[PDB]
Symmetry: C3
Subunit: 239 residues, 3 copies
């Protein structure tokens, strides 16, 4: 189904979906590397109760890269220069109750650009949903320790001020990596990140790095002053 087509206005209206969907399709005429500040927010609202927030002002690039990791990748077309498919459930669709509805909003758009939303529904229903969280490391701190237990993927902002990044595994061993080593390990699993319209392919962005977290309980980052490091994590859980 078709949800909305946004152009001209810098902010999108709160779009309400009553049909149980399972995935979202983002289409735009700008390249993946051209996204600067577009943000998305998706949440399921109940009736006489409290809302459930899956994404709260998450960057469009991070949202796209957190759902197209693996065999699949963001594609292109003659009309749309960027098409991405993002999963919201594990293997089915969201099971809506008597008074639930999905609500999607977009923030910080561009006046002379177009963005189209599509919904994908499948017969299977499931309760496992994806939750997105954000973590920040300031430009003044030297060493920062963060907890990533229970997560399976992460996206980190790439900068030249980052020196070392050390994992903490479930068995207690600690392994330290360089940014180049982390990038090589990331590209070892997913060689192609996106395909352009003319035919060229890109293996990754120049400012975002995807880290697959398997049996990782903590990450310690050592860097210097100058930039703020952003981490976006995704988890799967039952509501």
């Amino acid at each position: 189904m078709k949800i909305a087509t946004i152009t001209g206005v810098t902010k999108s209206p709160e779009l309400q979906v009553t049909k149980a969907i399972g995935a979202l399709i983002l289409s735009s005429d700008v390249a993946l590397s051209a996204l600067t500040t577009e943000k998305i927010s998706i949440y399921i609202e109940r009736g006489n109760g409290s809302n459930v927030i899956l994404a709260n002002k998450v960057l469009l690039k991070d949202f796209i890269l957190a759902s197209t990791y693996g065999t699949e990748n963001t594609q292109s077309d003659a009309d749309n220069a960027m098409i991405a498919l993002c999963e919201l459930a594990d293997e089915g669709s969201i099971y809506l109750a008597d008074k639930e509805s999905i609500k999607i909003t977009l923030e910080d758009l561009i006046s002379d650009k177009r963005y189209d939303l599509h919904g994908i529904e499948e017969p299977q229903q499931t309760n496992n949903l994806f939750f997105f969280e954000q973590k920040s490391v300031a430009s003044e701190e030297f060493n920062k320790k963060i907890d990533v237990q229970g997560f399976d993927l992460a996206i980190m902002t790439v900068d030249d001020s980052v020196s070392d990044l050390s994992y903490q595994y479930s068995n207690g061993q600690v392994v330290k990596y360089l940014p180049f080593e982390l990038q090589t390990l990331s590209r070892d699993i997913d060689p192609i990140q996106a395909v352009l319209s003319d035919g060229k392919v890109v293996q990754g962005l120049t400012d975002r790095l995807t880290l697959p977290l398997v049996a990782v309980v903590g990450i310690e980052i050592n860097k210097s002053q100058g930039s703020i490091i952003n981490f976006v994590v995704r988890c799967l859980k039952t509501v």
Copy 2:
């Protein structure tokens, strides 16, 4: 082994193979998108009995796209601009009886083009074979219902007159899709469809769409007048 090399003549002679092969290799100097009307027909002939028809005047593009879906894709070379490998069995080769032989013919070729056939045989033998069937929707009908039970793949002609396409699953649920949604779902599984000689890659043809049918028993197509829609289906069965 080498079967035949055809050039100059618009029709190929009936080529007979007595060795138990397991796959076919098509090589040509034209691009995959440049194929217009080439047709192929493959059938196994018995002795004192009736023949078995696996492909009966199937389009070359459909035959190529129905066998190179997934991890593999059609490749290129310095000499040949299109190389494709098509499987005829499940995991082995055709078990020929006392008087069986394979026969392959080509129709509607081009005078100034070259087409080379190769055969691939493997030690394992199997009885499961692939059968190709064709279905048509006329340019006058608005809504058409077809049955695709027992099939695992389909190829549909792409046109701008198609409005909606609805699946019927084994559990009874009916889901309707748009052509754009179907194309996105198709490209989600197989990102790259072919690789050109210069280095560029193409994610799909401009007039053919591949649909993986899993637990699908019927397809209902709603469109307008103007074009004829062609469906090519492939099934696996024991003879």
Copy 3:
């Protein structure tokens, strides 16, 4: 960790590693197809005992292609035109004893080129290691029979003088292939071999061919005079 950066000198010093690593990272500013005669040698030395040789003057191209076969492939970057990851163990790292150390050396380099080595370590430890062996067919012999039992991959030098290559399977069946058929079968499993910096991709080298050996005990090569054929084989075994 960082091992060494070599430039200006035609030979690299014997580099000693005391930390238990699990993989090697090769980075260079030359393209993969531009490698001509660079050779590598890696061996683990004990204390009061005999050394263990895993690679003894193996060509850089063969070493790279014998470890990047499958989903992964050699990548590129803005600074480095060739980045490759080569595994030395099965799923862990080498378990060093009380007096063991890894030693890596490079031979036949280029004066105006740069080569950087990196080490990758993971918490898991294992005893299964990879061993590389070389076989040669002279330019005078017509038919040569070689044994490849126990191996899972091979890399053969590509030349126009090779006529036929016949496998011998575990069940006794013998299947003969042409170089074109072998290349098509090789590209069927791994479509993309490397990705260039500008965006183009290459599906394989013009002088090296990768053969996946599954349940193969012998290979018989029939050719003519004119060139020397080189085979590089890799095996997994416990020390």
